[PDB]
Amino acid sequence: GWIRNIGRYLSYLVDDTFEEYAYDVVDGIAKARTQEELLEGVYKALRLAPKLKKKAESKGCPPPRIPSPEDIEALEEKVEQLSNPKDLRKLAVSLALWAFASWNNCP
């Protein structure tokens, strides 16, 4: 459900193979109470795409893949109607939950 693809992209900010350790964005996406800050955090996480691209390119392993545009609108087609924070947490926490998965990137 377009969760693994974005989780593997968020995993690029925590893994030691990318020696930048973007942990603030993980806290922002996990600690989201309403609509605006969750989108702000996911934008901040996605903004570091060239960082990861040039880090993997300059290190040797294949560059990371950006989340596909096909499920980008899928993110906003559901979170819009999660007016209640209680059910919004089920996805806000899960976004960072999948950010710590194994996600083998470079050999």
Q: Which residues here bind a copy of itself, judged by CB under 8 A? A: 3-4, 7, 11, 14, 21, 23, 26-27, 30, 35-36, 39-40, 42-43, 46-47, 49-50, 65-69, 72-73, 76, 86-87, 89-90, 93-94, 96-98, 100-103
Stretch that binds other proteins, among 3-11, 35-43, 46-54, 67-75 (CB under 8 A): 3-11
Could you tell me if 36 and 27 are in contact, meaning their C-beta atoms sit under 8 angstroms apart? no
* HEC sequence for 18-45: CCCCCCHHHHHHHCCCCHHHHHHHHHHH
Which residues in this chain contact other proteins in the complex, by CB under 8 A? 3-4, 7, 14, 23, 26, 30-31, 89-90, 93-94, 96-98, 100-103
